[PDB]
Structures are given as C-alpha cells and as structure tokens.
Write an enzyme that holds these catalytic residues in place. Sequence first.
Site, PDB file in Angstrom:
ATOM      1  CG  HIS A 167      -0.371   0.052   2.464  1.00 57.05           C
ATOM      2  ND1 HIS A 167       0.207  -1.262   3.453  1.00 57.05           N
ATOM      3  CD2 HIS A 167      -0.306   1.074   3.338  1.00 57.05           C
ATOM      4  CE1 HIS A 167       0.686  -0.631   4.096  1.00 57.05           C
ATOM      5  NE2 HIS A 167       0.182   0.502   4.659  1.00 57.05           N
ATOM      6  CG  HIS A 170      -3.532  -0.605   6.999  1.00 58.84           C
ATOM      7  ND1 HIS A 170      -2.887   0.297   8.754  1.00 58.84           N
ATOM      8  CD2 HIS A 170      -2.623  -0.163   6.871  1.00 58.84           C
ATOM      9  CE1 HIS A 170      -1.900   1.031   8.343  1.00 58.84           C
ATOM     10  NE2 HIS A 170      -1.842   0.538   7.214  1.00 58.84           N
ATOM     11  CG  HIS A 199       0.462   3.868   4.471  1.00 58.81           C
ATOM     12  ND1 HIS A 199      -0.497   3.545   5.862  1.00 58.81           N
ATOM     13  CD2 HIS A 199      -0.055   5.471   4.363  1.00 58.81           C
ATOM     14  CE1 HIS A 199      -1.681   3.911   6.264  1.00 58.81           C
ATOM     15  NE2 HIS A 199      -1.179   5.161   5.203  1.00 58.81           N
ATOM     16  CG  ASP A 244       5.045   0.821   6.279  1.00 61.99           C
ATOM     17  OD1 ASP A 244       3.927   1.345   5.448  1.00 61.99           O
ATOM     18  OD2 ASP A 244       4.487  -0.266   7.057  1.00 61.99           O
ATOM     19  CG  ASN A 275      -1.698   6.234  11.534  1.00 63.21           C
ATOM     20  OD1 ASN A 275      -2.962   7.044  11.138  1.00 63.21           O
ATOM     21  ND2 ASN A 275      -1.927   7.391  12.670  1.00 63.21           N
TER      22      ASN A 275
END
Length: 231
Positions: A83, A148, A85, A87, A179
């Site tokens: 995804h 998420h 993000h 990381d 988060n």
Amino acid sequence: EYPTVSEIPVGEVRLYQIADGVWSHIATQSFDGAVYPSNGLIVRDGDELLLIDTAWGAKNTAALLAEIEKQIGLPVTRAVSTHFHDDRVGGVDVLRAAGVATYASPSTRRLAEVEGNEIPTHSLEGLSSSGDAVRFGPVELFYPGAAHSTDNLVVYVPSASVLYGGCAIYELSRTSAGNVADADLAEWPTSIERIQQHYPEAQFVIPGHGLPGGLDLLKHTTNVVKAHTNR
Ligand SMILES: O=C(O)/C(S)=C/c1c(Cl)ccc(Cl)c1Cl
Ligand SMILES: [Zn+2]
Ligand SMILES: [Zn+2]
Ligand SMILES: [Zn+2]
C-alpha cells in the site's frame, strides 16, 4: 528465532527464510521516540527475485539490497508495494535507481502521490475490485477490499503456502489498533473474511509488522479492529 526490534538496529536489515525460495526481510524505524519493526517479503522466481515492499525508507532499502546481494546473490528485478504508506514505498526511488522495476495498483500510486510519498513506476491491473486476484510471477496478488487502507493488497506464495497480509494484518502481541487514519474500519473485517475465504490453506501468515503465525492472525485482527470500532 524470528528477529524482534531489540535485535535489529535502525539502519540494518535481516532476512528470514520461511520456505524454499521464500524470505521475509525485517527492518526497524524509530518514530515519535519509539522503535517499530516492519516486514516485507522476497520470493525467488527462477534466477531472479521478486521483492514485496521496501524496508521503510531509502537508508533501510539500500541496506536491504546489499543484504540480499550478500546472502542470496540473485538480482531483484521486480518489486510490488502493497500500500501507499512510507513503510511500503519509502525506498522506491532507491529500487528504481538500482534498476528494479517497481509496481503498485493504480490506486496505491494515486494515494502515494497525494501523500507526497515515493511512487512505484508501473501500475498493476486487475486489482480494482474487492475479491480480485492476479498472478504476478511466483505469487498471487489479492485485493481483499479496504482495510488498513483503501488500497491494501495481500500476497500469496502458492509453492510455500505463505500468506503475506501486509499491514492489513496485525501480529498477535498487537492488541490495540495502530494508525487507522487511512483505514476503512467498517469494511476491514469483511475484507479479512475475503482473505480467509481465498487462502484457507495458508500455513504461514506474515503481518506488516511483527511476528508471523498461522491463520489465527486474521481473526485476531478482526477482534482488535472491532474493539477499536467500539472504543
Ligand atoms: O500500522 C501500520 O502498519 C502502518 S503502515 C502505520 C502507518 C500509517 Cl497509518 C501511515 C504512515 C506510516 Cl509510515 C505508518 Cl508506519
Ligand atoms: Zn500503513
Ligand atoms: Zn505498516
Ligand atoms: Zn487475538
């Protein structure tokens, strides 16, 4: 024997061999005074490697590539980010500079762009609708629906029955929601159920962060998500 945070200095990256031709890579990042682990995957594809996700930043990702060359010694030719993000895509520019073809869903690319994050070059087709799956080299990519994040993908290695849930799946020791600013709390349990339906035979389940386990991690995540929902 699976590495934890205390064993991985930020900057450094560990590989953990899960099966024949399947590894996770583990890295760490410090954020707001705490240190977090993060997982990705490496799947052998003939004489080449497929990488799933960056090691959370340019520094860690450059160390991931050196660590792969040192320990495995086959070339990373492709990478999928699961995804948008940091990381997952932080380090994409490093991969691209090293001649790694980087991939993500159109949706992940658009969200990365908006967030001002690094953007995988190539767009993965066939993953726009919940339940969609496509073959990408030695893995199957699966869009379970929003969880998420609205874009999150999961990855399955049929040769080793390894299910990589990414950050849509929590480790067992994580009992409170991480988060969830970009989460679809409402859909998340339903999306996890699509994962359970599609890979009932998975023997190893890897979360985006922390220790692997079995398919119990799916119900565990639903439990945590629903609890958070009722906060
Ligand atoms: O809980 C998780 O798995 C992640 S990916 C938390 C997060 C979010 Cl929501 C945005 C940005 C970043 Cl960098 C991170 Cl780490
Ligand atoms: Zn995330
Ligand atoms: Zn994450
Ligand atoms: Zn639990």
